[PDB]
Amino acid sequence: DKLKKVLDKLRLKRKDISEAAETVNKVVERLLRRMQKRESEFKGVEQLNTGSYYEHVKISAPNEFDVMFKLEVPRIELQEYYETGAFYLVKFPLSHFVLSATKMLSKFRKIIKEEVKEIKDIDVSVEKEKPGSPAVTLLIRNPEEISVDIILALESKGSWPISTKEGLPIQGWLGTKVRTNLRREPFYLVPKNAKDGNSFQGETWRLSFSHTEKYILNNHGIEKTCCESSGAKCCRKECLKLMKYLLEQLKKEFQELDAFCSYHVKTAIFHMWTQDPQDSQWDPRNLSSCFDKLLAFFLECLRTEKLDHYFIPKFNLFSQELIDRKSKEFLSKKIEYERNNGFPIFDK
Amino acid sequence: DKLKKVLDKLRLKRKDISEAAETVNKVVERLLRRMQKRESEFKGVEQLNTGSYYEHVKISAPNEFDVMFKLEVPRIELQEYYETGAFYLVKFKRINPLSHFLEGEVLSATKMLSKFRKIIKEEVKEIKDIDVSVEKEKPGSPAVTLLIRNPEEISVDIILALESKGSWPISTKEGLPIQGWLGTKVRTNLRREPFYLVPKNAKDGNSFQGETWRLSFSHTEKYILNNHGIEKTCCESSGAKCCRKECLKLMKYLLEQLKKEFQELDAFCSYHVKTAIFHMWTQDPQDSQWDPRNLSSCFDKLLAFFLECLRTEKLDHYFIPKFNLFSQELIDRKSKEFLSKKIEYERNNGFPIFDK
DNA sequence: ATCTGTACATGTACAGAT
DNA sequence: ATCTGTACATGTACAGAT
DNA sequence: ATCTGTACATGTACAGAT
DNA sequence: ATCTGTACATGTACAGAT
Ligand SMILES: Nc1ncnc2c1ncn2[C@@H]1O[C@H](COP(=O)(O)OP(=O)(O)OP(=O)(O)O)[C@@H](O)[C@H]1O
Ligand SMILES: Nc1ncnc2c1ncn2[C@@H]1O[C@H](COP(=O)(O)OP(=O)(O)OP(=O)(O)O)[C@@H](O)[C@H]1O
Ligand SMILES: [Mg+2]
Ligand SMILES: [Mg+2]
Ligand SMILES: [Mn+2]
Ligand SMILES: [Mn+2]
Ligand SMILES: [Zn+2]
Ligand SMILES: [Zn+2]
Question: What's the distance, Cα to Cα, between the start and end of chain B in Å?
Fold first, then answer.
């Protein structure tokens, strides 16, 4: 009852969707164009739209879009970086860049900034670089604020790295045929651009499965008909939206929650969808029970300090090395509070 | 129980499968290489294995393989033959390797199938390691059939197919009604695949005889057979086993046994059985309506349904609704009532023909 | 020297065999 | 319940062509 | 190698019927 | 309240033309 009303608030409006989309489409097409017919090191970069807006789980407003400019590359000798599972060195046009991640992303960002300087019909700037991010982020105002993440990615057509062999455990849910075919797709690398002052950080890329997460979001039933015109609606995505919203409201209020992002909710719910594969475990009439069991799952994750990357099982997103024990214990208290008092944070 | 044991008789043996496939693959490899030589008009033809053996529903013995030699053909052509839904003339706006087979702008099917059969006959002549000859042409068949003695008898239907990548012909807009069973996404993807035309090749005395082609969906049928469930894990190693294919096998076998004994059943063929079960899978989409424990009643309802098709003289092509495979124009009422009685008899006497 | 149609290499579902 | 042959989808090598 | 055309998936929006 | 049917909107895959 309450939760249906929250979801009506979170719904994007069809007019807001078309106004933001045509501006975003304008800038992205023009930037993609500058990469090609202009003989750059990125000639042949291709576009792949990723993230919440294209998965149809964007909440509140259409104000943040995610785009991959992916580039196919051949002699890619990979070499796992110090057992982290998700970070890698790359070895063997691009002779201008070991293939250095910062070196390559710098030229990518120089080109974009240049072309953004030559855009006279939209209010669009390049956000100052965030050490920690693989993105070049645009800030558009038309007039409302829209941020766009342009993510450079290497594309490799080889088999997936050893560290993912036990990942993507969809066999009881989406099945073994879906899994084998998914793993026949390419995989993608992106910059680790964090200034932790640590080791090989500057040449380290990171695995990306944004194309696989997109498929799963739109092929999310054990039944082929789930959420189709001739099937039965489930509420899996509405739980993602509600869990994503509770963390947006908690991050807006407390800076002690700065280390948490939507990807932590996303990974948590991928495990929940695998734990509870049956589409009837997600009946719209049980929206409350499902949201509450997801909350509980996410609290068990904070209590055990354990949230494994859905595709890279040995890479713990909640390790002491990324998030303080106290930050997790903090988030836990605020979730339990919202939980056990009917979610006051939703009414503001 | 009784039906558990028929399926064990019906089950193919790996030794037999291994020996038959070794031979069959060597022959098809050689015929395919020869298609690519010289000014062969069929250079660029590609292989696609279809039929019961590759759908895993081939029963009793591995002795009949079906394989398409498909050839891609562009432009935008096609004219439906007399509102039949299934049959077409193939034209060409472009006026070239198929030029030797045109008649004006109309591509002759029996001209192409002749040159196709000629080349196969030659290459089989020069095979001196396998006992393999070319079966005398059957009217109405698009196939060039090989008979291999292995020393066991083995049939191989080489089917000549045109491949078109355009949208499917409008006579199929309402066909393939899988939206409640396999879903709309599957339907959209399946219909983005090519469609195929094979020679009609009758000598009926009808106008356009040697230039009439017939639609074929063997490739979409292979997908459906191997992806037959509402649940993605159906019959997979972390999902539940169903009994959809086991019903098709038992029914193939009922018709196979009867067609051996009685000549009256010559108008009937396994495609009729296959078509009927696609309707039954559409009527009963849930995997739970095909539980292995209810194999008896699953086979029973398919029987009832096949009987209703025979008596009401109605069995629509799964992909071309307006095409009725059981129309009086195709099979006599006398032929349909005969099989109808033979089916009720088996159904209501403990299935004696299985013990044959 | 590079290009590339052909065929080998790789991985895994399906289902027979044990 | 595990071992295993066949089919098949896609990546990759390279003898022979350019 | 590039780009438009097509079809239908995913949505929002709403009125009528339940 | 919710289910259904139609209108309206964007995203995406791929055939075919240039
Ligand atoms: N830490 C990460 N590791 C791997 N992939 C990530 C990570 N963070 C983000 N991604 C990928 O990039 C996409 C965009 O991330 P972003 O931060 O915009 O979140 P989102 O899923 O788009 O949702 P929202 O923007 O609405 O919070 C994600 O959907 C995911 O595929
Ligand atoms: N009359 C027909 N109309 C349309 N397609 C047909 C027809 N007959 C056969 N086919 C197609 O060609 C394939 C091969 O036909 P075939 O007679 O070998 O049957 P099958 O399904 O392979 O089984 P089996 O050979 O074991 O009886 C079929 O699976 C079907 O896809
Ligand atoms: Mg986003
Ligand atoms: Mg066959
Ligand atoms: Mn982002
Ligand atoms: Mn046949
Ligand atoms: Zn759903
Ligand atoms: Zn099944």
Answer: 17
Most A CBs within 10 A among B231, B232, B238, B241, hence the mutation to make, goes to B232
Give residue B153's identity as a one-letter amino acid code. E
> How many angstroms separate the CA of residue A302 from the nearest CA in chain B?
30
Ligand 1 pocket test target in A66, A258, A270 with most atoms within 8 Å of CB: A66
Does B238 contact A175 at a Cβ distance shorter than 8 Å?
A: yes
Asked whether the beta carbons of B35 and B117 are under 8 A apart, the reply is no
**Does residue B234 have a known ligand-binding role?**
yes
d(CA B127, CA B125): 6
What is the CA(B65)–ligand 6 centre distance, in A?
A: 7
Distance CA A288, CA A235 (A): 10
The sign of the CA dihedral A67, A72, A73, A76 is positive
3-state class of A296 per DSSP? helix
Task: Tell me which amino acid residue B66 is.
Answer: D
Residues forming beta bridges with residue A155, ordered by sequence position:
A72, A188
**Chain B residues with CB-CB distance to A under 8 A?**
179-186, 227, 229-233, 236-239
Question: Resolution of the deposited coordinates, in angstroms?
Answer: 2.8
- Report the chain A residue with the minimal C-alpha distance to residue B226: A177
Nearest to A224 among B183, B236, B238 (CB): B183
Based on the number of CB atoms within 10 Å of its own CB, is A302 exposed (0-12), middle (13-18) or buried (19 or more)? buried
Q: For the residues of B295-350, what is the DSSP string, one character each?
A: HHHHHHHHHHHHHHHHHTT--B-SS-TT-BTT-TTTS-HHHHHHHHHHHHHHHTTT
Angle value at C-alpha A258, between A252 and A260, nearest 5 degrees = 100
Cβ-Cβ pairs closer than 8 A, A with B, add up to 60
How many whole angstroms from A52 Cα to the centroid of ligand 1? 8
A305 belongs to an annotated ligand binding site: no
Write out the two tokens for B97.
């390797």
Annotated binding-site residue? A211: yes
DSSP letters for B22-66? HHHHHHHHHHHHHHTSTT-TTTT-EEEEESHHHHT---SSS-EEE
> Of B184, B232, B233, which is closest to A229 when you measure between CB atoms?
B184
Those residues with Cβ within 8 angstroms of residue B112's Cβ, 6 or more apart along the chain or in another chain: B41, B98, B101, B160, B199
Kindly state the DSSP code that residue A265 receives in the 8-state scheme: H
Nearest-Cα residue of chain A relative to residue B228: A224
State the CB neighbour count (10 A cutoff) for residue A190.
21
**Chain B hits for A175, Cβ within 8 Å:** 232-233, 236, 238-239
- Domain borders along chain B are 2-12+168-194+217-356, 13-167+195-216
Residues B31/B80, Cβ–Cβ less than 8 Å = no
**Experimental technique used?**
X-ray
Region of residue B201 (phi > 0: left; psi between -120 and 50: alpha; otherwise: beta): left
Close Cβ partners of A204 (under 8 Å, ≥ 6 residues apart): A81, A87, A88, A89, A101, A191, A192
Tell me which residue in B183, B227, B239 faces A228 most closely, judged by beta carbons: B183
Give the nucleotide with minimal C1' distance to the Cα of B188: E8
CA dihedral of A36, A42, A43, A48, whole degrees rounded to 10: -70
Under a CB-based contact definition with an 8 Å cutoff, are residues B276 and B315 in contact? yes
DSSP type of residue B146? E
For A308, which DSSP code? B
Whether residue A163 contacts residue A85, with contact meaning beta carbons closer than 8 Å, is answered with yes
